Amino acid sequence: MWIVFDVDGVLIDVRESYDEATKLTAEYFLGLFGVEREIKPEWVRELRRKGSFGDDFKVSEALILFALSGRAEELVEEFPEGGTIEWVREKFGFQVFGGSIERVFNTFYLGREYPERLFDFPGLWKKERPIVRRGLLERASKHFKLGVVTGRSALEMELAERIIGFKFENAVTREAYLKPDPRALWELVRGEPGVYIGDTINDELFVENYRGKYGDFDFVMVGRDVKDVNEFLENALEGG
Numbered sequence: 001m002w003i004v005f006d007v008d009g010v011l012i013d014v015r016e017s018y019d020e021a022t023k024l025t026a027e028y029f030l031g032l033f034g035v036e037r038e039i040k041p042e043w044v045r046e047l048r049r050k051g052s053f054g055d056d057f058k059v060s061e062a063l064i065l066f067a068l069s070g071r072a073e074e075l076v077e078e079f080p081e082g083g084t085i086e087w088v089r090e091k092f093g094f095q096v097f098g099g100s101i102e103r104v105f106n107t108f109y110l111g112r113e114y115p116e117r118l119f120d121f122p123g124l125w126k127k128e129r130p131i132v133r134r135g136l137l138e139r140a141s142k143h144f145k146l147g148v149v150t151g152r153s154a155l156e157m158e159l160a161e162r163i164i165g166f167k168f169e170n171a172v173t174r175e176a177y178l179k180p181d182p183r184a185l186w187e188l189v190r191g192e193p194g195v196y197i198g199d200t201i202n203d204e205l206f207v208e209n210y211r212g213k214y215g216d217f218d219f220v221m222v223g224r225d226v227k228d229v230n231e232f233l234e235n236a237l238e239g240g
């Protein structure tokens with residue numbers, strides 16, 4: 001039987017590492033324009049939640065422009081559900097210049113892991129913490145096929161393996177497929193039975209889509225259906 005995991009919020013607590021990278025990146029560009037007002041944490045969360053931004057480089061861009069305008073709070077509220085960076089760019093008439101934001105974001109998130117760093121910085125990725133106990137993955141790998149489907153890139157997945165202390169040979173990353181596309185799960189399991197362990201509704205939808213297209217597969221949501229992935233793995237080992 002397959003046990004397939006999400007990474008963020010299931011195996012790894014990304015202790016708001018991405019959120020602080022978004023904040024620091026925006027505040028870096030704000031500082032260039034002599035704006036010292038801080039980016040509020042709820043703005044990052046809410047804008048990402050309601051938006052359909054392509055990535056946190058785009059979320060950072062939106063926050064920079066909004067905070068430059070002095071009405072970020074109002075603009076977060078006004079921004080349409082399902083909006084993208086285009087709404088912001090059309091509104092203010094300005095956009096990011098080349099990879100300016102991406103280079104700064106990656107400097108803050110990756111630090112020395114980023115070969116094109118703009119300055120030396122201790123990567124925010126290292127504030128992420130394992131939720132899963134490696135001993136359980138080791139124990140489970142003897143009796144179940146293990147895999148991951150993650151929005152992480154291959155490089156970010158190597159980082160996750162460092163944080164966890166376990167290597168995943170069967171992994172789907174964003175180079176290949178993106179949840180909630182059910183082909184991501186088919187890629188791994190090819191119709192064999194199993195379960196996917198997620199932390200969000202998008203994970204639930206992913207598996208609903210798989211059931212719609214391919215066939216049966218279970219879904220468990222950490223913090224609703226089970227306390228965490230470790231209790232899940234212990235129940236699986238102790239009783240099927």
Ligand SMILES: [Cl-]
Pocket residue numbers: 008009010012013014015016
């Ligand atoms: Cl998390």
Ligand SMILES: [Cl-]
Pocket residue numbers: 052053054055058084085086
């Ligand atoms: Cl976007």
Ligand SMILES: [Cl-]
Pocket residue numbers: 037066067068069070071072073
């Ligand atoms: Cl503001």
Ligand SMILES: [Cl-]
Pocket residue numbers: 085086089
């Ligand atoms: Cl655009």
Ligand SMILES: [Cl-]
Pocket residue numbers: 111112121122123
């Ligand atoms: Cl470092």
Ligand SMILES: [Cl-]
Pocket residue numbers: 133135136139
């Ligand atoms: Cl153990």
Ligand SMILES: [Cl-]
Pocket residue numbers: 006007008149150151152179
């Ligand atoms: Cl994900």
Ligand SMILES: [Mg+2]
Pocket residue numbers: 006007008009010198199200
């Ligand atoms: Mg997740």
Ligand SMILES: [Mg+2]
Pocket residue numbers: 013014015016
């Ligand atoms: Mg947390």
Ligand SMILES: [Mg+2]
Pocket residue numbers: 227
């Ligand atoms: Mg309980």
